[PDB]
């Protein structure tokens, strides 16, 4: 379909799939799954998620729907001020239309206003980078919460989110490994997940 840089990508993906993942990151995720207790996993996941919910709000406004804009205002506010800086999902306990949901950020608004993705890069150590979503999302580091992160903090957040994401995927490892071509499937999942959030 796309992939002008399919050759470039497939080499970065095979480096990621069979060098960094078996030798690091996934071992780092097995230590995570066996040594950090489930409450600390739920608390970190909510704490990081919470720093994006002000931007999810500002972007639901731009995509025309100020109702969900204030669902994520309410999520940020109950959870920052009463849920211990985001550690507890109070809003989720308070009401069903305040459950945590996947971020809709500046890439989404760009995609919802019909802007096309980049080519499709696959990066070493990173994973998948479109010019519109990853990186377009960086526009949300111009206004507060994420403009408050130093560059060290942004990677810490990046890391713990990643190791957790890997840690959750630990139990369906396979079918990326028992699959004729795991680059085309991994990429297909990419665009289906990313087109859904740009709605």
């Amino acid at each position: 379909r796309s992939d002008p840089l399919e050759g470039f990508n497939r080499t970065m993906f095979n480096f990621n799939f069979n060098v960094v993942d078996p030798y690091v990151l996934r071992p780092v995720a097995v230590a995570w799954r066996d040594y950090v207790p489930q409450p600390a996993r739920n608390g970190l996941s909510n704490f990081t998620s919470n720093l994006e919910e002000p931007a999810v709000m500002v972007n639901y406004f731009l995509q025309g729907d100020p109702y969900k804009g204030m669902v994520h205002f309410t999520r940020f506010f109950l959870n920052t001020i009463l849920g211990m800086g985001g550690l507890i999902d109070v809003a989720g306990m308070a009401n069903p239309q305040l459950q945590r949901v996947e971020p809709h950020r500046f890439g989404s608004t760009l995609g919802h206003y019909g802007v096309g993705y980049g080519p499709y890069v696959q990066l070493p150590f990173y994973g998948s980078f479109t010019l519109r979503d990853e990186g377009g999302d960086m526009a949300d580091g111009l206004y507060p919460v994420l403009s408050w992160l130093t560059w060290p903090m942004s990677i810490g957040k990046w890391a713990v989110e990643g190791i957790e994401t890997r840690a959750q995927l630990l139990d369906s490892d396979g079918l990326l490994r028992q699959s004729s071509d795991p680059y085309i499937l991994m990429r297909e999942a990419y665009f289906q997940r990313h087109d859904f959030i740009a709605n």
Binding site: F73, T74, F77, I81
Partner: protein, 344 residues
């Protein structure tokens, strides 16, 4: 909460505890502001025609030491009778009728309603007010309510203008009266007017240096919309020798104005936008035309149920720092507030 209802006697113990904190560059506003309200509401049915009632409500501040002083005070205390379609009459410490319309803008999460003060010529709660009220205009004009009210002198602590409950010029008053009229038009829209008129004490016109005049009046009109989880409201007031110019005295003329807009979400959050403004004219030491109050206010409250709610409120303060702010003691700085509220 209704804690008593046996044989035509009802008793209501009510109040709220509000853990509340202010962030501000103004060290007079900044810090803990936790406080508490407690009150009782009583009803006694005498006949079918006649029913008697009383209410008291107390404010006690939980944001200081146990060795600290004057942390409590009485906000309301009055008794009265209710005559059915001839109305009601009450006496005590109670709200001015001016507040029967200006209350329509007093709906912010924690700020607002500060173009006027307490103990200020019947714009809000006052000592010594008798109040006749009548709903549906003597049972004639359905939805039209009027109120009439008189207040005696509350003078100096000592001297020729003194009374038993004396106080300083800023909350003194001579004899005065006021009245209010409000009409519920096409379900949700509402119009109201309020007038007040009071004599001023010799100290009023000698001690503060700002504000001269024998009397103190206010003219108020307001509208409001309350339907489909939308709430819009606005109020305009003119006052003569009635609105205070902070610590410096009173404004001989002042025009006060408020706008509020609110939406109520099904999931329980109610955001609020408002703009407020008080401008004083002909002040006496060269101040001339000065602003007393001016800010945009953005905030929100999340309601967990009828008994528990939380809120944030952000006062964006547009006063510049005049020689007049900095001599009247008017806060120039912004303020943010977070509160968690249990009420019973």
């Amino acid at each position: 909460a209704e804690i008593y209802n046996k044989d035509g006697n009802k008793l209501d113990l009510y109040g709220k505890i509000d853990g509340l904190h202010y962030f501000s560059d103004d060290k007079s506003v900044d810090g803990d502001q936790t406080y508490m309200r407690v009150g009782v509401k009583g009803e006694t049915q005498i006949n079918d025609q006649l029913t008697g009632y009383g209410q008291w409500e107390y404010n006690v501040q939980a944001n200081n030491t146990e060795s600290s002083s004057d942390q409590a005070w009485t906000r309301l205390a009055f008794a009265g009778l209710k005559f059915g379609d001839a109305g009601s009459f009450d006496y005590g410490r109670n709200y001015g009728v001016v507040y029967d319309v200006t209350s329509w803008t007093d709906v912010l999460p924690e700020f607002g309603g500060d173009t006027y003060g307490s103990d200020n010529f019947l714009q809000s709660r006052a000592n010594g007010v008798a109040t006749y009220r009548n709903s549906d205009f003597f049972g004639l004009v359905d939805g039209l309510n009027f109120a009439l009210q008189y207040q005696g002198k509350n003078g100096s602590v000592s001297g020729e203008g003194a009374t038993n409950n004396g106080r300083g010029w800023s909350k003194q008053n001579g004899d005065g009266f006021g009245t209010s009229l409000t009409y519920d038009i096409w379900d949700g829209i509402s119009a109201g007017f309020a007038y007040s008129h009071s004599k001023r004490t010799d100290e009023q016109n000698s001690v503060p240096a700002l504000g001269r005049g024998d009397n103190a009046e206010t003219y108020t009109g307001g509208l409001k919309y309350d339907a489909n989880n939308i709430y819009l409201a606005s109020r305009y007031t003119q006052t003569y020798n009635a609105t205070r110019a902070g610590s410096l005295g009173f404004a001989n003329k002042a025009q006060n104005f408020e706008v509020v807009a609110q939406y109520q979400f099904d999931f329980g959050l109610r955001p609020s936008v408002a703009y407020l403004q008080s401008k004083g004219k002909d002040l006496e030491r060269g101040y001339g035309d000065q602003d007393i109050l001016k800010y945009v206010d953005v905030g929100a409250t999340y309601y967990f149920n009828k008994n528990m709610s939380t809120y944030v409120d952000y006062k964006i303060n547009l006063l510049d720092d005049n020689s007049f702010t900095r001599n009247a003691g008017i806060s120039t700085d912004d303020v943010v507030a977070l509160g968690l509220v249990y009420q019973f």
